Design a protein around this ligand. Structure first.
Ligand SMILES: Cc1ccc(S(=O)(=O)Nc2cc3c(c(O)c2O)C(=O)c2ccccc2C3=O)cc1
Ligand SMILES: [Cl-]
Lengths: 237, 233
């Protein structure tokens, strides 16, 4: 096809192991999640992939995934662009809580409701929240307006703030002929995939992208996929 | 009262920093990487914050930067890479050790090269083991014919580094952005010579330490207000 686009979702974080809600909390990769990034990188290397520009979030689990991939394909010299708009979904007041704490405080019914909803956000991260200053006062978000910096996000919100970056910064690069690599998170990449494929809310909520696996799109000049997304790796993976 | 930080990368693999590594894309050795970690460590201990980073397109410099951002927990910073901050291109000498260089060219000519600001080594010819590896590398594909060197005098190196300094780095500093530059001995020589107004002789005698944060305090004219300070224990 005219264009080729590659996505990669970061693997396991240190908080995944604690089964806590990370969201915008900047958890690093676990050793195993770092190895996942190494395997992805290796798959891209074995297939001879070349990029011209890379996009990632401002969260280190994604950024470190990118670094690991560039290292494996010997393209550390590529231009890299970071943006909060590709950050994981903001889980608001749930941030820092584990599974038990969440069901204990809110009940199974309510957590099931948050889980299955496209457009209901979790509770806001208020100023007395233990990670409030850690996230909302981090200088990396200093250029954000009041309306841009979320206290919490529905999946709809996450996608809504990811897609402007896609349209305004990545899309022109692709049409300029640049080969793009995006290293980001489950839900921001869900935003990109929902847009590319014209998926429904129902469909996108049932889509779980695998972690650490290069995801390959073949796009026409209008950035319409010409075939289903392909996963890159050995046969078992 | 601007604050500027420079860092020169440490040891590269296979003793290449003692073999005119130049534009060959040598990685850090484990030890050069540990030097970078110590630098990062010192910057963290002093509570340094940056807003933007500049580096070359050579992986030993880039990995040095990565190691530093990792240690100071600022992996989210914007990073700009440029060939103009590359190491000096040592032409046909690239990859050769001291003995091989003297064997091939004689002590007289090597002494003349060591001491010249403006005499380049011989060009890297098609029979050099790194010729296609470097000249056909995709990262330089947009460089014009005159821009991609076959060899460089120190003068050449500085001449192509300073335009990036003036056009890209200077406006950031004047905006108050706190800049970190992770690069190479001779490109950082270019910057230091411009800042301090050094003579050719002085800049040729200046050997910046590796893996150590080098700190500048600049006035409203980007003129240093005191000598460079080294950061560490
Ligand atoms: C931190 C954490 C706790 C519990 C789980 S789970 O075993 O129940 N699997 C799981 C859970 C959720 C979710 C999920 O996809 C899932 O696989 C959600 O998407 C979700 C969205 C909004 C609020 C809560 C959830 C949610 O709890 C996963 C992660
Ligand atoms: Cl980077």
């Amino acid at each position: 096809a005219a264009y080729k686009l590659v996505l990669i979702r970061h693997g396991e974080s240190a908080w995944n192991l604690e089964n806590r809600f990370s969201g915008w909390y900047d958890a690093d990769l676990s050793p195993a999640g770092h190895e996942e990034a190494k395997r992805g990188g290796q798959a891209l290397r074995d297939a001879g992939y070349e990029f011209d520009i890379c996009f990632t979030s401002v969260q280190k689990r994604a950024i470190r995934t990118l670094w690991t991939v560039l290292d494996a394909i010997d393209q550390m010299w590529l231009p890299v662009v970071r943006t909060w708009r590709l950050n994981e979904r903001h889980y608001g007041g749930l941030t820092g809580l584990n599974k038990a704490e969440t069901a204990a405080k809110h009940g199974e019914a309510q957590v099931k409701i948050w889980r299955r909803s496209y457009d209901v956000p979790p509770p806001p991260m208020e100023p007395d929240h233990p990670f409030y200053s850690n996230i909302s006062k981090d200088r990396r978000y200093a250029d954000l307006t009041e309306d841009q910096l979320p206290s919490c996000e529905s999946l709809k919100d996450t996608i809504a703030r990811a897609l402007p970056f896609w349209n305004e910064e990545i899309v022109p690069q692709i049409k300029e002929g640049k080969r793009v690599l995006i290293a980001a998170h489950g839900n921001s990449l869900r935003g990109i995939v929902k847009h590319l494929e014209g998926l429904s809310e129902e469909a996108i909520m049932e889509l779980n992208l695998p972690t650490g696996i290069p995801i390959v799109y073949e796009l026409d000049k209008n950035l319409k996929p010409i075939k289903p997304m392909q996963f890159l790796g050995d046969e078992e993976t």
